[PDB]
């Protein structure tokens, strides 16, 4: 009965990496399969997340522009599967006696939450370990984006995301992976289309990737503990708090 954690994780989060987007399987006619670079391109640029559930749109074959991105996104998925998420959580906002709890009280774990700056460091290390450098386009573009994530996580307004703010001063043409040609002048419609694709990716990267990690690895609550402040608990510590709260009140 381990199917529950995936389902409840998908709906409500706070159950760890198992229900994280990149760990999900694509549904075939007879069952399920691991996702490949081509599948990810579909999720990011074409059908969206529902591609995993069978949603199809034309073109079926990837255009040449997006076909050339396959190796890079395959690389991304490979780096994701090799990423030591537990280690990175343990070296940014580690657990304090959760598996060794023994007989600790509820108040012992209440102070054990992660500040938004710590949640940034974890998410920052994840971006460095998973996202291939050539996808950033430049060192300038990676640093601007990292600053955008920092502000986003600090603000605590996860629904007030702005693409215009995310893309501001990003150098679109630094990203070779958007292009089908380096020869000749770049017309407005091509630049506009390059901006459109990069928008999708950068926006996915915040909403899908970054927020995905936050949703899976943490649980935020609006207590506890005074009004008003948002506290992020590692989902393991949150699972401990729920358990001890509902054991004393349930004989």
UniProtKB/Swiss-Prot annotation:
<protein>
    <recommendedName>
        <fullName>Telomerase reverse transcriptase</fullName>
    </recommendedName>
</protein>
<comment type="subunit">
    <text>Catalytic subunit of the telomerase holoenzyme complex composed minimally of TERT and the telomerase RNA template component (TERC).</text>
</comment>
<feature type="region of interest" description="Interaction with RNA template">
    <location>
        <begin position="62"/>
        <end position="67"/>
    </location>
</feature>
<comment type="function">
    <text>Telomerase is a ribonucleoprotein enzyme essential for the replication of chromosome termini in most eukaryotes. It elongates telomeres. It is a reverse transcriptase that adds simple sequence repeats to chromosome ends by copying a template sequence within the RNA component of the enzyme.</text>
</comment>
<feature type="region of interest" description="Interaction with RNA template">
    <location>
        <begin position="168"/>
        <end position="193"/>
    </location>
</feature>
<feature type="short sequence motif" description="TFLY; involved in RNA binding">
    <location>
        <begin position="7"/>
        <end position="12"/>
    </location>
</feature>
<comment type="similarity">
    <text>Belongs to the reverse transcriptase family. Telomerase subfamily.</text>
</comment>
């Amino acid at each position: 009965s381990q199917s529950f954690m995936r389902t409840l994780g998908f709906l409500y989060g706070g159950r760890g990496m198992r229900s994280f987007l990149l760990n999900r399987k694509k549904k075939t006619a007879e069952g399920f399969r691991k996702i490949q670079g081509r599948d990810l391109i579909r999720i990011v640029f074409f059908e969206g997340v529902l591609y995993l559930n069978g949603l199809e749109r034309k073109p079926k074959k990837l255009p040449r522009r997006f076909f050339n991105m396959v190796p890079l996104f395959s690389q991304l998925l490979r780096q994701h599967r090799r990423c030591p998420y537990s280690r990175l959580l343990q070296k940014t906002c580690p657990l304090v006696g959760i598996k060794d709890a023994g007989q600790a009280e509820l108040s012992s774990f209440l102070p054990q939450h992660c500040g938004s700056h710590r949640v940034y460091l974890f998410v920052r290390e994840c971006l460095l370990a998973v996202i291939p450098q050539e996808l950033w386009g430049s060192e300038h573009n990676r640093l601007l984006y990292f600053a955008r994530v920092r502000f986003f996580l600090r603000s605590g307004k996860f629904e007030r995301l702005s693409v215009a703010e995310l893309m501001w001063k990003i150098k679109v043409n630094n990203c070779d992976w958007l292009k089908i040609s380096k020869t000749g002048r770049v017309p407005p419609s091509e630049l506009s289309y390059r901006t459109q694709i990069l928008g999708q990716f950068l926006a996915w990267l915040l909403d899908g990737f970054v927020v995905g990690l936050v949703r899976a690895c943490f649980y935020a609550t609006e207590s506890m503990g005074q009004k008003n402040a948002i506290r992020f608990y590692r989902q393991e510590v949150w699972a401990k708090l729920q358990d001890l709260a509902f054991r004393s009140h349930i004989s």
